[PDB]
């Protein structure tokens with residue numbers, strides 16, 4: 001009830017969300033630094049081209065390296081040794097450029113929100129209870145959009161291995177499944193853009 005305790009509970013929660021989210025970032029940065037030659041078997045990177053170029057997302061450029069890093073943010077919880085199998089399923093996606101586009105976007109949107117908040121994680125007390133709450137619910141939701149995307153792609157590995165809905169034995173069903181997945185993830189991506197923006201809006205600091 002007394003506002004000091006409310007305010008401080010919120011500074012506690014933001015503190016913990018911000019460090020948990022920083023651990024995730026230290027982890028996908030490290031996933032890039034230790035990326036082997038074959039990019040964990042994600043051969044789809046080679047098939048994805050910048051806008052009017054022969055440069056792929058597999059090449060050794062800053063923008064290419066960042067695209068794969070943000071993709072590894074989104075895929076961060078999947079076991080590294082399953083990414084080859086994940087890429088084999090997705091190669092069959094009719095919208096893999098767009099799909100991978102959204103992986104990059106969730107990663108980047110995420111990365112921007114934590115890069116903005118990490119340096120301020122101990123000095124959020126200048127905000128007022130209303131828009132400290134909005135900050136916390138916004139960021140926690142952002143973490144959530146990206147987590148769900150990770151769960152969805154993890155689940156696809158098991159469903160495909162199980163032949164669920166005949167996804168393994170029927171290519172047409174695999175395709176519409178993958179298409180539906182891309183719509184789901186695309187919403188999560190749009191929704192993640194709004195929340196990075198909300199967050200940047202109310203935490204100038």
Ligand SMILES: N[C@@H](CCC(=O)N[C@@H](CS)C(=O)NCC(=O)O)C(=O)O
Nearest residue numbers: 063067070097098100101104105108
């Ligand atoms: N449209 C690109 C992806 C664009 C996108 O939304 N992703 C972000 C992060 S991976 C991005 O392009 N960042 C690279 C940049 O902004 O230079 C695609 O279709 O594959």
